[PDB]
Design an enzyme around this catalytic site. Structure first.
Site, PDB file in Angstrom:
ATOM      1  N   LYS C 301       0.721  -1.401   0.164  1.00  0.00           N
ATOM      2  CA  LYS C 301      -0.705   0.249  -0.406  1.00  0.00           C
ATOM      3  C   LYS C 301       0.672   1.664  -0.342  1.00  0.00           C
ATOM      4  O   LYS C 301       1.094   1.651   1.167  1.00  0.00           O
ATOM      5  CB  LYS C 301      -0.907  -0.176   1.035  1.00  0.00           C
ATOM      6  CG  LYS C 301      -1.814  -1.340   1.049  1.00  0.00           C
ATOM      7  CD  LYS C 301      -2.725  -0.871   2.603  1.00  0.00           C
ATOM      8  CE  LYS C 301      -4.193  -2.569   2.592  1.00  0.00           C
ATOM      9  NZ  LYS C 301      -5.060  -2.088   1.383  1.00  0.00           N
ATOM     10  N   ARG C 378     -10.621 -11.451   0.827  1.00  0.00           N
ATOM     11  CA  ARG C 378     -11.249 -12.795  -0.190  1.00  0.00           C
ATOM     12  C   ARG C 378     -10.439 -14.085   0.190  1.00  0.00           C
ATOM     13  O   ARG C 378     -11.006 -15.443  -0.204  1.00  0.00           O
ATOM     14  CB  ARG C 378     -10.902 -13.166  -1.045  1.00  0.00           C
ATOM     15  CG  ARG C 378      -9.946 -12.461  -2.384  1.00  0.00           C
ATOM     16  CD  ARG C 378     -10.271 -11.935  -3.721  1.00  0.00           C
ATOM     17  NE  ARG C 378     -10.441 -10.737  -3.068  1.00  0.00           N
ATOM     18  CZ  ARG C 378     -10.500 -10.239  -4.776  1.00  0.00           C
ATOM     19  NH1 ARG C 378     -10.018 -10.143  -5.236  1.00  0.00           N
ATOM     20  NH2 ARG C 378     -11.475  -8.519  -4.117  1.00  0.00           N
TER      21      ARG C 378
HETATM   22 ZN   LIG Z   1      -5.645  -6.096   1.242  1.00  0.00          ZN
END
Ligand SMILES: [Zn+2]
Ligand SMILES: [Zn+2]
Ligand SMILES: [Zn+2]
Ligand SMILES: [Zn+2]
Ligand SMILES: [Zn+2]
Ligand SMILES: [Zn+2]
Lengths: 517, 510, 518
Positions: C301, C378
């Site tokens: 990120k 997920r």
């Molecule tokens: Zn993530």
């Protein structure tokens, strides 16, 4: 063979390799056209062109030994079909023995002399008719004019695209492969010495593709070197895998620094093929073997970096191992070939090497690292010093080095650099006979001054020149002092982006270079 | 003909220096076997040492004792021959007059490359900009052939000259040369002076900013240059580029306040014509990028006054050809000059335009306007019925990632013409490398609606794709394409190179 | 159970406040028909004016004090309107010569207050509670609210009133004093009385989840979070089971273990169970995403807008599940069996981390080609859903801060729900209405399924052709639920209160109302 380290017990400990593919079970039979065609079971396909007339009419010019099929294939019925490159049609009819047969054609355009790309377009259409059909035999009739190299290239490409890699499928699967392949071609006796040469060249490309497509959790420095040992054992090749303790004694500081941040120890692959008759040619093949390129602390975070594809940063190593199979099988003589690769993984860790660190190569040269993602030339630098010490006549390295190749030659042609006429020209000649296109690119010495480091002997990257592929060759040239050396940058051509698969680029090019000396 | 203005203070013409101080320097070449004499001025020795960087050793029976004792081997061991180093000292001669002597190191590679010879010139010129002497003598203690010697003189003249047309607030008069076979190099002297100005003239046009150098004022200078050289000339205006239906070229200039101007100069030789040649140059006086505005880092929008370097190289070549007057050749100097601006009248990304040969083009990027203007220029060039078409353009910035800032790339459809360009690159010492036109990428120019796409949206090899686009507009003639987007501007010295002038001229003469 | 440390100063547990000042407030509800006694502290009237856009204030309740009734006369309130959120303070002396404080909070001119409107009303009430040293607050309801909205008023009052000071040392609030009594005068008081202690239970379940989320990742790690869940199960008397790495290896949870490969904290799978006294007619598995910190892995990120500093909240779904476990374990519903599940781990950058392009094998045998390490939620839920389906439940509900694309679809207010079964989705929407935690139904477009076809693995983890990541992620999760009715709530955009700089505790009331109404 070493034990592959794991974080959890579910981590794979070996790369799966398919050695006995369905392609190896295909019985290939070639006949001469001047004897007529026998329309048999399965699918029979004619390769037709029309020189001069763009999208001209289809005309079958071969004697078919069937009155019914000859009436179907008459000129007054081919008419409604044209020869546009890549077009295909299917025919269903009954032969003289009241049996239903399947016939068709693939258009080969005008042009008369088909390029490697054009032949691939023809082959892809051929594979579409082989797909989703349950044929037991395919027959190909050559009404287009091809030489021996292009005929072998046709078989290699057909085998490669027909083959489907399902090693990593579990819940997914589907349907079968044909068992027989017939080929009708003029002067057939001259072309069929290439048949078993095409089968050998096919698996080398598929074996390299298998290693490239294998992900980095499967294909890591430990498991990749183990596969080379396994391959060398089946081909009876001499092999030596160098561990960190031996690489420390050889002072390979550039190669060792790249793999510091990996959980997998560095492994240097050294395979050797020796000829029986006295050796009059010594060749060393070097391949870049970064099983995964995270980029290091210069992390691949920009949008275009394509980090999810960086399992392919060992494509150079796979090309050399693919050459080791082809050379190890056909067994040329009067040659020693050394298959080398400095294998490691470029990761981010507390143990990783830093941007700005100064490291020492095995030849005494000190290097200031300016970007950790330029790790290829660092591992290649120590591999070239190792290669030159073997006392070889030619050193050829192949590497997915710089993404700048996508902006210079693109995805179709690889770039070759070097310090010598004939090694470049012999490589360029091998590109012609292997049908793997390569273009000669210059080593511009004016850029060498931009590698002048204020503190180290040489900078790893330039600070002004944005031609990364040329600068990298200048850097690598500094580590080959007396031997003829060439460098193949395959960073743009290794991966087939449209087909989402490797190409196995380099196997046939490198093998043809070894076989033509 | 009249340059439009927004304010009364806007310029209406490009200033050009025609009579530079270089043109006043009388050059004399002597044979080194007779020894050197350092009467007046500054004398510089070019020294090497195969096996360095090691010391310099002067080999000349210089007939002045004071400088000869200074140039003794025991006094030159304290200086080395590193490529570029220089040391010069001033002292008194036998007549008690002040003279200056020095050296420039040339390394250990015996044969200096084009870049190496350049670096030697920069060191020599550096002392010249700190000089108030009237005479300079150069002694060649290194090996140079006739072509590299001329290249040395051209680079010396070009780097010595300083462009002060836009400043508001000296030069030597004699040049001496000592070298073997002065008779063989004597004929090369005035060729270098002609090659110098053609390069310097092209640099003047390139360095001229876009408020000074616009489509109208650039074509006015081409006519003025054609009149002084006496070449046939015709400048095509809009009302009759419209008659030729140059839709690709006219769409680029729609957003500009300057009308499009097509330059057509012609040279015809006295001997019988055995070669008809058309030289085409990209002539964008300013490239804003269009609605695909050059706003990304690296776009270099402040340097986009250089996007007419190909046109300037073509105009500079017209000087050299028009002056030396080669024969058995007819050359057409062509450039479709316009300006790519952002306006309510500008053409849009996605617009479908029609070239002068009927081909419809879907515009995918307004900053790719160079190939649109070259497309109509090539149709015009082929209609002339010439034997060779060679175009030179600052087309794609991807060349900075292919060959860099030193080597230019050439593409083409004819092997013989390509060899002439590469052979001319060797004698002109302006480096060019051959790059392929890979027909595999042509399918990515297939437009869903037009005849052909302007750009490829998948293949990132813009230099190769753009060459594929230009090739679609040359039907029968041997044609080559020189991309100088990476080599035109010298970023380190913040000035143009005038690249291509000598390359095109050597191609015409050989 | 033992938390690993880098230095001896690293925390070894998540500090949790169980006995909050809210739990010491005596709450009493009175009938408005008998009149209000104003006596001490602050008395607040919830006043409206239907039709009149910010019309004048009118106190319409019988006050049992002559002095305070004279102050609250209509002729004295020229100057205050009912604009939503407006509040005023009054000072006076009552009939016993005692000084009292009276005020009002404007509730607008819309007779039916929305969930966002009521929150704005409560926030104005808390501002009057702050910077004041009162011992009792009294609220007079001159507005119409149902039993759910009255409870929602109490929960929001309790939640916004409390201030979390576990991590203050040299900067605690010295002027912080909580009221000890709360009086409420409301129409038909006896029907609202039962909502009081349900609101307090709903308050702590939401506050407990907020405590876990607000705890940073150096305090809240896979080990300390599962340790707190065990502690919660022991206080409530629920069955509890924490699965270690060796048990997850035997269950072949390759996707879950691959995400946490690069962490210094071992993976910990939370499995709490509440079973009914009596016969069970509903088996439910509640799954919460428990990523204690999401650096993104090698897909780090690093791009602007990724808010890497907020990724301690990537376990908000797990906190909402554990907060519901408190509410269910306290209110003790029956004819139901509930499983509270969470596959807790940390997504880190290391030499042991999993890489983009890696192919992993889930517990159901499906091979997955990893396309982005920041899509790790997920992956962990896939193994948790397979584990949940093996439990033999009727409904599987997963809740996760999955995709940042939720910010661009529904924003910061409404959560998105996906599913394969209509009645479960309808039940989720009904629970959203009664819990007053807004949720919107979004589609699982099957046309995008083809973009998850991997060339080598059974399925791709990401699409990278379709830019609708919230829908694509639901396509992926659907592949790991074969026969059970399943729903998925994406809370990535609504979990964190950006303006208030604190978590929302979203999902606790929604999941409990879903459990309590089936
Ligand atoms: Zn993530
Ligand atoms: Zn790299
Ligand atoms: Zn690399
Ligand atoms: Zn442009
Ligand atoms: Zn341009
Ligand atoms: Zn996450």
């Amino acid at each position: 063979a070493s034990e592959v380290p794991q974080v959890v017990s579910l981590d794979p400990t070996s790369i799966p390799i398919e050695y006995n593919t369905p392609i190896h079970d295909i019985k290939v039979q070639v006949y001469d056209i001047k004897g007529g065609c026998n329309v048999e079971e399965g699918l029979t396909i004619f390769l037709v062109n029309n020189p001069g007339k763009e999208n001209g009419p289809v005309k079958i010019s071969s004697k078919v030994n069937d009155k019914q099929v000859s009436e179907f294939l008459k000129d007054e019925n081919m008419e409604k079909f044209n020869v546009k490159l890549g077009t295909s049609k299917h025919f269903y009819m009954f032969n003289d023995n009241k049996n239903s047969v399947a016939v068709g054609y693939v258009g080969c355009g005008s042009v008369a002399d088909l390029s490697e790309a054009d032949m691939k377009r023809v082959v892809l259409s051929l594979v579409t008719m082989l797909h989703d059909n349950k044929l037991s035999k395919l027959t190909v009739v050559f009404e287009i004019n091809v030489d021996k190299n292009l005929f072998r290239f046709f078989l290699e490409t057909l085998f490669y695209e027909y083959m489907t890699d399902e090693r990593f499928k579990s819940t997914d699967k589907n349907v079968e492969y044909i068992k027989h392949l017939g080929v009708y071609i003029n002067n057939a006796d001259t072309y069929k010495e290439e048949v078993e040469k095409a089968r050998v060249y096919y698996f080398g490309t598929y074996y390299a593709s298998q290693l490239i497509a294998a992900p980095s959790n499967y294909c890591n420095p430990v498991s990749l070197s183990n596969a080379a040992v396994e391959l060398a054992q089946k081909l009876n090749l001499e092999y030596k895998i160098l561990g960190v303790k031996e690489l420390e004694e050889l002072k390979m500081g550039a190669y060792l620094s790249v793999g510091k941040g990996s959980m997998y120890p560095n492994k240097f692959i050294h395979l050797t093929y020796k000829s029986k008759g006295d050796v009059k040619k010594k060749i060393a093949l070097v391949g870049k073997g970064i099983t995964f390129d995270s980029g290091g602390y210069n992390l691949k975070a920009a949008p275009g970096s394509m980090i999810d594809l960086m399992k392919f940063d060992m494509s150079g190593c796979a090309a050399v191992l693919g050459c080791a199979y082809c050379v190890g099988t056909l067994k040329p003589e009067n040659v020693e070939i050394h298959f080398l690769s400095a294998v490691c993984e470029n990761m981010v860790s507390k143990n990783s090497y830093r941007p700005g660190d100064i490291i020492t190569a095995s030849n005494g040269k000190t290097i200031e690292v300016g970007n950790t993602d330029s790790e290829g030339r660092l591992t290649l630098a120590d591999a070239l010093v190792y290669a030159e010490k073997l006392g070889v006549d030619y050193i050829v390295d192949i590497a997915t080095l710089t993404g700048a190749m996508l902006y210079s030659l693109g995805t179709s042609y690889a770039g070759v650099f070097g310090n010598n006429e004939e090694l470049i020209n012999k490589i360029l000649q091998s590109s012609k006979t292997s049908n793997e296109p390569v273009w000669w690119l210059p080593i511009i010495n004016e850029y060498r001054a931009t590698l002048n480091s204020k503190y180290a002997d040489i900078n790893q990257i330039s600070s002004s020149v944005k031609a990364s592929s040329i600068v990298a060759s200048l850097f690598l040239k500094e580590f080959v002092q007396n031997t003829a050396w060439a460098h193949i940058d395959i960073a743009g051509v290794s991966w087939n982006f449209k087909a989402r698969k490797p190409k196995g680029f380099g196997v046939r090019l490198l093998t043809e270079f070894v076989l033509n000396d």
